[PDB]
Design a protein around this ligand. Structure first.
Ligand SMILES: *[C@@H]1O[C@H](CO)[C@@H](O[C@@H]2O[C@H](CO)[C@@H](O)[C@H](O)[C@H]2NC(C)=O)[C@H](O)[C@H]1NC(C)=O
Ligand SMILES: *[C@@H]1O[C@H](CO)[C@@H](O[C@@H]2O[C@H](CO)[C@@H](O)[C@H](O)[C@H]2NC(C)=O)[C@H](O)[C@H]1NC(C)=O
Ligand SMILES: *[C@@H]1O[C@H](CO)[C@@H](O)[C@H](O)[C@H]1NC(C)=O
Ligand SMILES: *[C@@H]1O[C@H](CO)[C@@H](O)[C@H](O)[C@H]1NC(C)=O
Ligand SMILES: *[C@@H]1O[C@H](CO)[C@@H](O)[C@H](O)[C@H]1NC(C)=O
Ligand SMILES: *[C@@H]1O[C@H](CO)[C@@H](O)[C@H](O)[C@H]1NC(C)=O
Ligand SMILES: *[C@@H]1O[C@H](CO)[C@@H](O)[C@H](O)[C@H]1NC(C)=O
Ligand SMILES: *[C@@H]1O[C@H](CO)[C@@H](O)[C@H](O)[C@H]1NC(C)=O
Ligand SMILES: *[C@@H]1O[C@H](CO)[C@@H](O)[C@H](O)[C@H]1NC(C)=O
Lengths: 120, 252, 99, 361, 50, 49
């Protein structure tokens, strides 16, 4: 909050603007990376209520309805196993929506094969 | 009044291991759930500390060099150790510091005292023979009393920038002979503005009269060296563990 | 140590933020690391010099932080492009590519 | 946004344009309730001072100190302060003050400074190069000069080696200036170490008595005992205030804490080594200093070809501290929140997106 | 004098470390490409043209 | 080996630790690259005589 310090800092020009622009570029780059990785489908697929897949079990990778986070048991284990002018911007995609994207991808690759990645 | 004690039994001084004792709070700063690395006068872990006894006939009251700091450990019962003697020449030529704890309070004085060659106190089952004169006083401070072996008293004395820091900790132990192995961080008790040179110290004991008898007590002297400690602070803000950065490569 | 890669990324980001915080405690040759102490203890002709030293030290620290953040951003972008390629080719189809 | 982007046409998107900063309302100062005034009267208005070889040192602590009476006085010819501003002596808090009072002559007043030489600097009184404190010198021709000479003020003229800082030498040993062992008897090449000033009121200002009081302030990582007479205000919490806790200046929103400080622990620091909690000097209460709600001001707009309507996002700022909607990203002003879900047009963050159809979020 | 030498050498060392980081990133990209070629050309037959 | 130079260098903070950490990361990254490229098999196959 020192005004004299800012007055002396104005002699150095637009260094602060360059640092802010670089950090803004990194921040939008993270959202672009998440968008490219997870948002590869525009249809949100769901599995059928009856899990008749010819004996194949997907309970460890499908989302658990009992959990409020709507995550898979494996995803729940993964989330449990990971532990002055500074601000942290939240990611554009929340963990619930990323879990929803993975659920849609799992439902597509289980119920529709590779056809959903190339079309309907 | 001074009395020569001529009924002592000759014995060499003992030595023992410091283990992980002698840690104190470097500052008045609360820290919660963090690891802090600090560079200060600290006592080395597992070091060779000098062990002195008071048993009956042993009466160990020598004068030792202060160096850069003093760690005083006391396995004490019935309060034989009452105070300390701090100075350079320990006579009226220079100015000396006196720490005493009698039956009522603690007195801290910075004056020109004439110390006896053998200073002690005495309990009759009423005897004060520690000085003969006091000429020029500059600082007086009267405070509340700080105090099988039942009590363990840890003290750290430092002379930094003319400031005498006394750190202390009381610990209830039940070990018969040696220092117990464990961790106990010493809280800062009192900072005295003295601004004087101190290079030598001497413990003050108390006699038991029923000649004289020495009560059962044992104390340990360790020396502070400049080093780095990594201190662990818990949720409640007490130091529960420490790492000596110059002891071994694992702690490094 | 199954999830060491994500824990390494989180630890690197946290350590970089902590290092950027701890760079504020260095005086960079000034009398103190606190601006209020300099502004209260010295006249503006010498406080200007001390604040200038703090400004250039903190600016160098911030430039170092932004440069290493850009390098890590390039590395994470490469990893994310690889992850998107694996998402397209391994999940959305069957890949003939070995390993 | 046009000013920030240096363009008159703004493309559709979100642009970080400014930095919101909550500004402190009032100033709160909390000091311990010490009302006994520091003994500067005994230091400055003593009947007789001491000679410069036996300069008098007084310890000042555990009192409120008033430095206004020193500054406004029109007798102190020299008021040279090193490391502290002389006007800002009243503001700061210290732990211990050392008052070194002595009497010298006029030409040797300039030797009482860090880094000069002379007989007083070498053999009588040496100041350290890192001295933080003030030197107050005033003429005392009426009190320390006598017609016929006032010879009770002495200075050490001969010594083997130069003095250490804050060291005194009251020894009276006959200095041998030759190669003859003369057994402590004055004579040829054996001189007394102490020489008298011999002050007379007819003597010039170079050889007139000047009383010098050197105040040395030491500020450690210790609770401050010497402070100014600044009044302690009432405790106003949960508001963005400038604060001064026992010399610990800052700005923050002080609240009620649940931390259990030990009695010696005055303030507190976090994992990032920033001061986050203090003890109240008066009521011994622990107060959490959270800092101010700084945020990024971003402007969300469509293209200027489409419309001129904008929305403002305050990042990480609650809506009560600034068409107002609360998001996890921050407070959004100017966008109507709807319950319907559409595709993301302008990203806001935390699952929030904005679009134009008015601006909706 | 040592302050001038320290800031000059520190700037030179930071420049060297920045160049080493950029070259290390380039070599890491090349090594990832080489590992991809080792997996797909040596350990199998690739349908990828060129 | 100048101790005065190191005492002046300590005023600048942990720049040297940062540079050593970056160089150590590059040094282990080279071994990681070689490990990824060449160590793609855990069995040492031998040609017939
Ligand atoms: C698929 O796998 C899950 C988990 O391995 C099976 O769920 C178990 O069901 C039995 C009884 O059928 C329970 O005793 C277990 O506690 C369940 N395990 C868990 C982790 O909940 C499930 O039965 C399998 N089959 C189908 C069709 O879902
Ligand atoms: C106790 O013993 C000490 C040491 O023997 C005595 O100190 C000496 O006293 C004589 C007395 O004339 C002096 O000449 C010596 O110079 C002293 N020694 C030192 C090292 O100064 C002490 O006086 C004895 N106490 C009593 C009460 O007799
Ligand atoms: C401590 O020192 C004594 C003598 O100086 C020696 O006999 C003893 O072995 C030492 N003990 C340790 C643990 O070093
Ligand atoms: C303890 O010492 C103080 C200091 O002189 C004295 O006032 C007090 O009476 C003493 N108490 C006893 C029991 O001797
Ligand atoms: C110290 O005490 C001696 C003995 O009474 C006395 O002659 C001398 O003047 C005193 N010095 C000071 C500075 O009080
Ligand atoms: C302190 O006393 C010792 C022994 O008399 C002496 O060697 C040392 O120089 C003294 N230090 C100071 C600062 O007076
Ligand atoms: C901290 O204090 C709480 C009580 O406030 C106690 O229950 C807990 O055991 C303590 N933890 C430690 C590590 O001392
Ligand atoms: C000394 O006495 C004069 C007499 O009026 C007074 O004005 C001055 O404030 C006094 N100085 C101090 C430090 O008390
Ligand atoms: C004055 O301060 C003391 C602590 O120094 C405290 O115990 C006491 O309650 C305070 N009194 C008032 C009226 O604030």
């Amino acid at each position: 909050d020192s005004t004299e310090c800012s007055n002396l800092l104005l002699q150095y020009g637009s260094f602060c603007t360059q640092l802010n622009r670089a950090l803004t570029g990194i921040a939008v780059e993270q959202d672009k990376n998440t968008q490219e990785v997870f948002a590869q489908v525009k249809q949100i697929y769901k599995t059928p209520p009856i899990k008749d897949f010819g004996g194949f079990n997907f309970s460890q990778i499908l989302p658990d309805p009992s959990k409020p986070s709507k995550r898979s048991p494996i995803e729940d284990l993964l989330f449990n196993k990971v532990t002055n002018g500074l601000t942290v911007l939240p990611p554009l995609l929340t963990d619930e929506m990323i879990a929803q994207y993975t659920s849609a991808l799992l439902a597509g690759t289980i119920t529709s094969g590779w056809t959903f990645g190339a079309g309907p | 009044q001074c009395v020569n004690l001529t009924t002592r039994t000759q014995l060499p001084p003992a030595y023992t291991n410091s283990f992980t004792r002698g840690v104190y709070y470097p500052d008045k700063v609360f820290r919660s759930s963090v690891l802090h690395s600090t560079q200060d006068l600290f006592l080395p872990f597992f070091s060779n500390v000098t062990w002195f006894h008071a048993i009956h006939k042993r009466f160990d009251n020598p004068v030792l060099p202060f160096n850069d700091g003093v760690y005083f450990a006391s396995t004490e019962k019935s309060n034989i150790i009452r105070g300390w003697i701090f100075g350079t020449t320990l006579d009226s030529k220079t100015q000396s510091l006196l720490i005493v704890n009698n039956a009522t309070n603690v007195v801290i004085k910075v004056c020109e005292f004439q110390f006896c060659n053998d200073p002690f106190l005495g309990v009759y089952y009423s005897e004060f023979r520690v000085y003969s004169s006091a000429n020029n006083c500059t600082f007086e401070y009267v405070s509340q009393p700080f105090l099988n072996f039942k009590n363990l008293r840890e003290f750290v004395f430092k002379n930094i920038d003319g400031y005498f820091k006394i750190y202390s900790k009381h610990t209830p132990i039940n070990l018969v002979r040696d220092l117990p192995q464990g961790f106990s961080a010493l809280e800062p008790l009192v900072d005295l503005p003295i601004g004087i040179n101190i290079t030598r110290f001497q413990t003050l004991l108390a006699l038991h009269r029923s000649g004289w008898t020495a009560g059962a007590a044992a104390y340990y002297v360790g020396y502070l060296q400049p080093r780095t400690f990594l201190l662990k602070y818990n949720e409640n803000g007490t130091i529960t563990d420490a790492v000596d950065c110059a002891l071994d490569p694992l702690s490094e | 140590s199954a999830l060491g890669k994500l824990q390494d990324v989180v630890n690197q980001n946290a350590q970089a933020l902590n290092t950027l915080v701890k760079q504020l405690s260095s005086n960079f040759g000034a009398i103190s690391s606190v601006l209020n102490d300099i502004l209260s203890r010295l006249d503006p002709p010498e406080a200007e010099v001390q604040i200038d030293r703090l400004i250039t030290g903190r600016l160098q620290s911030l430039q170092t932080y932004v440069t290493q953040q850009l390098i890590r951003a390039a590395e994470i972008r490469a990893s994310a492009n690889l992850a998107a390629t694996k998402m397209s080719e391994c999940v959305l189809g069957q890949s003939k590519r070995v390993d | 946004t046009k000013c920030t982007l240096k363009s008159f046409t703004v493309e559709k998107g979100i642009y970080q344009t400014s930095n919101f900063r909550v500004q402190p309302t009032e100033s709160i100062v909390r000091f311990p309730n010490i009302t006994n005034l520091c003994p500067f009267g005994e230091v400055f208005n003593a009947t007789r001072f001491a000679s410069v070889y036996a300069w008098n040192r007084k310890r000042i602590s555990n009192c409120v100190a008033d430095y206004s009476v020193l500054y406004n006085s029109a007798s102190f010819s020299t008021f040279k302060c090193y490391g502290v501003s002389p006007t800002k002596l009243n503001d700061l808090c210290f732990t211990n003050v050392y008052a070194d009072s002595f009497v010298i002559r006029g030409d040797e007043v300039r030797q009482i400074a860090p880094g000069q030489t002379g007989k007083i600097a070498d053999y009588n009184y040496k100041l350290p190069d890192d001295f933080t404190g003030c030197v107050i010198a005033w003429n005392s021709n009426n009190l320390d000069s006598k017609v016929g000479g006032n010879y009770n003020y002495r200075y050490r003229l001969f010594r083997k080696s130069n003095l250490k800082p804050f060291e005194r030498d009251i020894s009276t040993e006959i200095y041998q200036a030759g190669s003859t062992p003369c057994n402590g008897v004055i004579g040829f090449n054996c001189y007394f170490p102490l020489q008298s000033y011999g002050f007379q009121p007819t003597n010039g200002v170079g050889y007139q008595p000047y009383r010098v009081v050197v105040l040395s302030f030491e500020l450690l990582h210790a609770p401050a005992t010497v402070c100014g007479p600044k009044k302690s205000t009432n405790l106003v919490k949960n508001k963005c205030v400038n604060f001064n806790f026992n010399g610990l200046t800052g700005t923050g929103v002080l609240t009620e804490s649940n931390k259990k400080f030990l009695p010696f622990q005055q303030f507190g620091r976090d994992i990032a080594d920033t001061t986050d909690a203090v003890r109240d000097p008066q009521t011994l209460e622990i107060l959490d200093i959270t800092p101010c709600s700084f945020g990024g001001v971003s402007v969300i707009t469509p293209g200027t070809n489409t419309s001129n309507q904008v929305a403002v996002l305050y990042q990480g700022v609650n809506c009560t501290e600034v068409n107002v909607f609360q998001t996890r990203a921050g407070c959004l002003i100017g966008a109507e929140h709807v319950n319907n879900s559409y595709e993301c047009d302008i990203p806001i963050g935390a699952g929030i997106c904005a679009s134009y159809q008015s601006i909706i979020a």
